């Protein structure tokens, strides 16, 4: 069980992201590992000495002259640098590892102009549901109006043939009068389109 | 102080 | 005076009497200050000096867990060479490994080495560069080419340079009134018959730190090296050393023949005779 | 697989005073494998109380080992040290001159 | 090929045996068997130098392990409590001293105390809406899977027969449906946008696809419905040239 700071940054993307483990116990080996939801953690960079170890891209990683101490540094980040960053001490034989940072990354927003849209399903019926989308990466969303209507998270989209990037929450109710003005006048919206 | 480090399997 | 710090381990196979038999033990100058035994009832890493004894707690639970990591590295070690070299399980076999660092006067790194060794003879060996290998034959290419891919002399190289020396000058500073210490030889001489017309005068030097010393017989002023007998350096067993040096000698002229002797305890040379 | 002789050597802490308490040492080096067997005798039975070394190698691969007793040297007293090893076909005893 | 895990997944009862299996090719080595849990990271279970020796970890405790031969590391757990719902990880190393730690692809592990609220996926898709075609030139569709319980749901989106990427954003974690009770349902959405040229093409197909992960076909089930397996639910969508 290792000292990790932070334990979750949100950064803006292309700036730089820092993070670093403290021990109390020397080590002879500092790791750096990037785990994906879904996956297992591959290892990024391994230290033997200190002094900066530079990358396999845009990463340095460092490894104190006490040997208690390492840090990580991404520069320039990208959107596929989102995920969970654990740092691990080796003993001999055996690994600690920290207790793991999750990055998140707002991405860039070029031309926001937020707007809801009532989508309509594909079989037959009147079950709708309401989209919330291009809206700026300031904005953001909340979820309540009681327990019968379900606002999600926000996520970004990514149409790169079109230079394009978005963002879009979605919204449905069960079988009620609920209406796409009555759904998210309970976040902190712009100044927005209807229909 | 012995290595802790650089010593693997033949 | 030039110092050094080294490990040396030794690994061996004992069939149907159950798991290897693991030693190791360290070494600054010539003064051991830690071992490790794998039938000693501790199976802790143990102190064997009194200056190493202040180091705390940590000190001795990280270089426990590092060498038994040393041992399970040779305990697997002894099956692989075993499949090398197609031998069968039931025969005893060796693997040594020897490590460390020198210093200078100034405590500036000199060298570094790591050696390895199966069954007594060369295996692999680092060399001075410390980022390449000498294998000794063909069995021993295939560790070569383990060991490039894994880029095991990198790692080494960090410690070989960097921790090794860090922790030998830390060694020197806290033992300085022991390992920084010279005795000087105490020296005589002795004469004895081998027949009426045949003497042996027999050089001797006694209770010296460090091992290093150079006896050495003259004649008439020109040295004479085919009648002499030189033993091997041993230890007296209070941390110094013994040695001794012969000659067969023709009877009623041991005058002509002066005994010389260097150590780094000695501001001049010394040098004993009979007339 | 290689095989090596020991060499023997046995001597004492210090000059030897008659009557004045000392230290008896056998220094069995130069050996390949690593089992070896060593006792000291006294006036050819065996002491009892042998400590040793811990096992260490030279620069070529060959092993030394360094036995010792505490012993009180005396005239009519034989000592010796007895040594046997895979290279050796009957143990080899090397008895101790104090007048080297 | 590396490290394999199996099962990948598995959804089982309170009192049950189970095995995960962790197989590695590359020959002698040692491995580990550990855990991740949202506050507590990577704990240790049990740990291999070599075959028939293993020793414990941080929480070993209602776990057992096993190493007949060097490729393969049996974590078995001889009656599945419900605190043992994890995600589990195989690990390696190379023999040596200081030599780091490669990782398995994850088991990920469900024990219930009652298999009966075990439900598969709905999975519904909506068309893009007339107002965002006029408004942005673009089209998405969103994708509901909605009532599954537990939340081992993998979705993918397929354009005429080619899973796709670019265009899609599926919801980090679910949602709750009822959170009121405590083994409620879940719902998770997901988006797939393309250009208004596309979807009004008539010749594009589009599909929804949720992989759900449940029982095994030799369960036990009495009830009504059909039998929650581990199961492909999927939604379907044509292009509409207005």
Redesign the interface.
């Known amino acids: ?1 290792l000292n990790q700071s932070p334990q979750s940054m949100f950064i803006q993307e292309g700036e730089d992201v820092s993070m670093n483990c403290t021990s109390s ?2 080590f ?2 500092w ?1 750096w ?1 990037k785990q994906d ?7 990024l960079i ?1 230290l ?3 002094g900066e170890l530079t990358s396999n891209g845009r990463l340095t990683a460092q490894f104190g002259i006490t040997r208690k101490d390492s840090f990580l540094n991404i520069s320039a980040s990208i959107p596929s640098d989102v995920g969970i960053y ?1 740092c ?1 001490g ?6 600690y ?4 940072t999750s990055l998140t990354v707002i991405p860039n927003i070029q031309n926001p ?1 937020p ?1 809801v ?7 037959s019926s009147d ?3 309401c ?1 919330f ?2 809206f700026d990466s300031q904005t953001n969303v909340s979820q309540s109006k009681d ?1 019968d209507v ?1 606002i ?2 926000k ?8 230079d ?1 990037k ?1 963002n ?1 929450a ?1 919204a ?1 109710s069960n079988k009620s009068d609920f209406a796409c003005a009555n759904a998210f006048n309970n976040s902190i919206i712009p100044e927005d ?1 209807f ?1 | 102080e012995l290595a802790g480090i650089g010593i693997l399997t033949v | 005076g030039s110092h050094s710090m080294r490990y040396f381990f030794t690994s061996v196979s004992r069939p149907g009497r159950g798991e290897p038999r693991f030693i190791a033990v360290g070494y600054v100058d010539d003064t051991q200050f830690v071992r490790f035994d794998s039938d000693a009832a501790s199976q802790r890493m143990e102190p064997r000096a009194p200056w190493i004894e202040q180091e705390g707690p940590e000190y001795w639970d990280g270089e426990t867990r590092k060498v038994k990591a040393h041992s399970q590295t040779h305990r697997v070690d002894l099956g692989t060479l075993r499949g090398y070299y197609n031998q069968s399980e039931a025969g005893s076999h060796t693997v040594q490994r020897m490590y460390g660092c020198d210093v200078g006067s100034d405590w500036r790194f000199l060298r570094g080495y790591h050696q390895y060794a199966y069954d007594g003879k060369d295996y692999i060996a680092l060399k001075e560069d410390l980022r390449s290998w000498t294998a000794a034959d063909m069995a021993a290419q295939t560790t070569k080419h383990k060991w490039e891919a894994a880029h095991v002399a990198e790692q080494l190289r960090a410690y070989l340079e960097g921790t090794c020396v860090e922790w030998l000058r830390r060694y020197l500073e806290n033992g300085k009134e022991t390992l920084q210490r010279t005795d000087a030889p105490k020296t005589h001489m002795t004469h004895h018959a081998v027949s009426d017309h045949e003497a042996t005068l027999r050089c001797w030097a006694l209770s010296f730190y460090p091992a290093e010393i150079t006896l050495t017989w003259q004649r008439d002023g020109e040295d004479q090296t085919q009648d002499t007998e030189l033993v091997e350096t041993r230890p007296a067993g209070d941390g110094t050393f013994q040695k001794w040096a012969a000659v067969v000698v023709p009877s009623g002229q041991e005058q002509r023949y002066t005994c010389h002797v260097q150590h780094e305890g000695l501001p001049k040379p010394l040098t004993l005779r009979w007339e | 697989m290689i095989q090596r002789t020991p060499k023997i050597q046995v001597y004492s802490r210090h000059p030897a005073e008659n009557g004045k308490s000392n230290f008896l040492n056998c220094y069995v080096s130069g050996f390949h494998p690593s089992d070896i067997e060593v006792d000291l005798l006294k006036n050819g039975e065996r002491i009892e109380k042998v400590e040793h070394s811990d096992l260490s190698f030279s620069k070529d691969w060959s092993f030394y080992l360094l036995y010792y007793t505490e012993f009180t040297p005396t005239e009519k007293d034989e000592y010796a040290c007895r040594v046997n090893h895979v290279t050796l076909s009957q143990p080899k005893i090397v008895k101790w001159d104090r007048d080297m | 090929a590396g490290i394999t895990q199996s099962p990948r997944h598995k959804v089982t009862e309170t009192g049950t045996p189970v095995t995960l299996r962790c197989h590695q090719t590359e020959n002698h080595r040692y491995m580990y068997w550990y855990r991740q849990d949202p506050g507590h990271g990577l704990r240790l279970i049990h740990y291999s130098y070599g075959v028939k020796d293993t020793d414990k970890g941080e929480v070993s405790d209602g776990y057992s392990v096993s190493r007949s031969k060097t490729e393969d590391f049996l974590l078995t757990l001889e009656s599945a409590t419900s605190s043992q719902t994890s995600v589990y990880f195989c690990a390696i190393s190379e023999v040596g001293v200081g030599q780091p730690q490669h990782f398995g692809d994850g088991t990920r592990l469900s024990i219930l105390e009652d298999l009966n609220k075990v439900f598969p996926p709905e999975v519904a898709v909506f068309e893009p809406s007339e107002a965002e075609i006029s408004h942005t030139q673009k089209a998405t569709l969103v994708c509901l899977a909605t009532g599954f319980y537990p939340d081992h749901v993998e979705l993918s989106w397929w354009v005429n027969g080619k899973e796709v990427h670019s265009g899609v954003c599926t919801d980090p974690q679910p949602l709750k449906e009822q959170p009121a009770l405590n083994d409620s349902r879940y719902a998770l959405s997901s988006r797939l946008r393309v250009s208004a040229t596309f979807w009004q093409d008539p010749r594009n197909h589009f599909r929804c696809q949720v992989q759900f992960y449940g029982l095994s076909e030799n369960d036990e089930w009495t009830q009504d419905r059909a039998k929650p397996v581990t199961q492909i639910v999927s939604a379907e969508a044509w292009g509409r040239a207005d």
């Open positions: 069980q116990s020397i002879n080996t790791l590992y939801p879904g996956e297992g953690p591959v290892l391994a033997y000495k200190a654990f691990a080796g003993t001999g034989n055996q690994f590892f920290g207790t793991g102009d707007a849209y009532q989508l309509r399903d594909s079989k079950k709708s549901v989209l989308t291009d327990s379900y999600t998270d996520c970004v989209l990514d149409m790169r043939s079109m394009f978005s879009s979605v449905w389109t229909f």
